[PDB]
Design a protein around this ligand. Structure first.
Ligand SMILES: CCOc1ccc(C(C)=O)cc1-c1cc(NC(=O)c2ccco2)cc(-c2ccn(C)n2)c1
Length: 126
């Protein structure tokens, strides 16, 4: 019924490092996906109450969204680019699990994922 709290985005106990791949994930990948025409349902956690999707968090137990990824990148929450890439993949997979193939939101996520993969293919070395 109710929304869960959003995913955690900061942890002062976790170690921190800035890498060129994490910098690319924020300044290129996140920035580019955020401005896509289809980004807005993915810019914040799914509000299943407001969207009237009462079973959403009965089905989706690893919610993820780009608003959370943006804060995680800003707060140096990730040690590895791969952790951030996994969050993007979780966001897309969540949409494909909850929604019927071919639904409007699924086509929107598919377009975002294609652009994501294009940018991930140009992830710099190190
Ligand atoms: C009907 C089922 O809709 C959904 C089901 C599941 C999911 C997820 C994320 O699994 C998302 C939607 C969804 C949400 C929103 N709008 C926002 O999330 C929003 C709006 C403002 C702030 O946030 C819009 C559209 C939509 C589809 C076509 N158009 C033109 N618009 C679809």
């Amino acid at each position: 019924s109710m929304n869960p709290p959003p995913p955690e985005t900061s942890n002062p106990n976790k170690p921190k490092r800035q890498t060129n791949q994490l910098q690319y994930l924020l300044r290129v990948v996140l920035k580019t996906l955020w401005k896509h025409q289809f980004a807005w349902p993915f810019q914040q956690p799914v509000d299943a109450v407001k969207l009237n999707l009462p079973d959403y968090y009965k089905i989706i137990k690893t919610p993820m969204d780009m608003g959370t990824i943006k804060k995680r990148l800003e707060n140096n929450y990730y040690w590895n680019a791969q952790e951030c890439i996994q969050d993007f993949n979780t966001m897309f997979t969540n949409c494909y699990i909850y929604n019927k193939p071919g639904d409007d939101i699924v086509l929107m996520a598919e377009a975002l994922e294609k652009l994501f993969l294009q940018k991930i293919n140009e992830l710099p070395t190190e």
